[model samples]
Target: MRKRGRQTYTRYQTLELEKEFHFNRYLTRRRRIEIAHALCLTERQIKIWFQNRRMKWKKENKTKGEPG
Candidate 1:
């Protein structure tokens, strides 16, 4: 299937989208459907992004260990 909006943050083109998600979690979540509508992504994509971002954080914490 054709990809919608942009690819995930791993690609160069997606870095900006990822950065937007990183700095604007509250806004994004609150307005997720609106944001998805504005960005031409499916709501599922937005939801998955948040899920994956949390997973990314967990993976980082696993690697980095607890803060001192």
Candidate 2:
């Protein structure tokens, strides 16, 4: 099997992606895709961002024994 190449994200790019997701929690999945595309990102990126955000929040709140 061929090895896959690496992908790199700059600090600013990542922060911008994150901030966009954070600003639109109340939006539907379709709306999230619109936001991502406006930022020149794929819809999948927005999905993964929300998924990771939920897991991270789970971990933090689980540690504190509070709702995330």
Candidate 3:
């Protein structure tokens, strides 16, 4: 028997997470724990994911509604 560590997420999982981000950029601690448990990942990983996602969204939308 072997143990798996730090598994990589599949495309579907990544897409599903992105969908969650579409609704809210910030996730509550409870919500983070829920997602982490459901996804078999660490809370920190999910939190970092959300943080990175929000940062990406900000970078992309920073120039929005502005004069080009």
Candidate 4:
């Protein structure tokens, strides 16, 4: 099997992501920029974190059988 490389965020990074997520569930254009600057991460990484986090929380709150 080919080894796959993926980003593993530090505690600090995770902290920042959750703080922002709690503040804003949906990422706005400006917020995305802010998140990148705050974490010193590229916008792509910031955007990725947001998407991953959203899916996690979304899954927890919403079941597969959810109608909406």
Candidates sorted by TM-score, best first: 4, 3, 2, 1
Model 3 misplaced regions, further than 4 Å: 1-7, 63-68
On residues 36-64, what C-alpha lDDT tens digit does candidate 1 reach at each position? Answer: 66666666776776666667575665684
Cα lDDT computed for each candidate against the true fold: 0.62, 0.61, 0.72, 0.77
Q: Which candidate gets the maximum lDDT versus the true structure?
A: 4
**Candidate 3 lDDT by residue in tens digits, 1-68:** 32344546787777767887787778888887877777666677777677778885677766767677
Where model 4 places Cα greater than 4 Å from the true spot, the runs are 1-5, 64-68
Off by over 4 Å in 1: 1-13, 26-30, 62-68
Q: Show the colliding residue pairs in model 2.
A: none
Model 1 quality (TM-score)? 0.50
| Per-residue alpha-carbon lDDT of candidate 2 for residues 1-48, written as tens digits (9 for 90 to 100) | 322223254567668766765785444777766766666655665566
Question: Which residue pairs in candidate 1 have backbone atoms (N, alpha carbon, C) closer than 3 angstroms, thus clashing?
Answer: none
Give the TM-scores of the predictions, in the order they appear.
0.50, 0.52, 0.67, 0.70
State the lDDT of candidate 4 residue by residue for 1-68, as single tens digits: 22223776689888988888888888888878877788877777777777888885777775767576
**Candidate 4 or 1, higher TM-score:** 4
